[PDB]
Write a protein that binds this ligand. Sequence first.
Ligand SMILES: Cn1cc(Nc2nccc(N3C[C@H]4CC[C@@H](C3)N4C(=O)[C@@H]3CC3(F)F)n2)cn1
Length: 281
Amino acid sequence: PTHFEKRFLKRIRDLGEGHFGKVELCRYDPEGDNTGEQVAVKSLKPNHIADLKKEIEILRNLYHENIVKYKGICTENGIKLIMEFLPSGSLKEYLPKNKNKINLKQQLKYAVQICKGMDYLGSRQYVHRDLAARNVLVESEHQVKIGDFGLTKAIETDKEYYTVKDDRDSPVFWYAPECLMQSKFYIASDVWSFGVTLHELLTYCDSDSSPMALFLKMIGPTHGQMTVTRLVNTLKEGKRLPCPPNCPDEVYQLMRKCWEFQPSNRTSFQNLIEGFEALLK
Ligand SMILES: Cn1cc(Nc2nccc(N3C[C@H]4CC[C@@H](C3)N4C(=O)[C@@H]3CC3(F)F)n2)cn1
């Protein structure tokens, strides 16, 4: 029922890569009549296996309207994560093709959807650690879902954060100062990355208005080594990504709330929900 044979997992096209993971469009066709359903299959990049095995345990224990649905596993030593395929892709591929279709009312509805999904993650005691628009999938012009949990970690009961040990290649331009300074990840660290994802959403994911592109015009040339140190100084000086063009005061003021230096001063995901919903008539 929840098992998927590798032989029936017919490879169609690549969907996204990482550094220890890759995602493909496959059709699970055990009848062989080409009538099976299209699925997304996450597997290891040619270890690292227990990392994906821990991701399976997380997505299996997740059931929400705004979280990509778990379908099952394909075992080989190796293992694959089988989920629902969302043909529109992520916001990164969707938004630049729909600048005319997606208005402020719609982006606000995506914000609510990203927040409800994130809040449900917070309730299950997890920290996402990779909240970016590239990981927010479009189900329709009305529905979005969180599509990757590759750096998601469980917060120890009664503890407020998770401390990352290794952290080989994390999205530093989406990171709060606690993460950059102490390798500590709170639910409030996820809030900050939402603010950044929101900025991307408001800029229709315009490539040259991305957090990386903009922060490197405030920091300048740096390379891997110094990137984080200069990033911390910028944020220490109160500097933040500016209000996107056409963004109203009310929305940017909710975005600024995610970006309070101290984890304890930042807004919650439930407050963002109520906050955005109040702007939707
Ligand atoms: C371009 N495109 C994608 C679809 N559909 C679709 N349905 C479900 C998941 C999914 N994901 C791709 C991306 C976004 C989230 C995660 C799964 N992917 C990754 O890149 C992970 C990091 C890693 F490669 F493992 N993509 C359609 N066009």
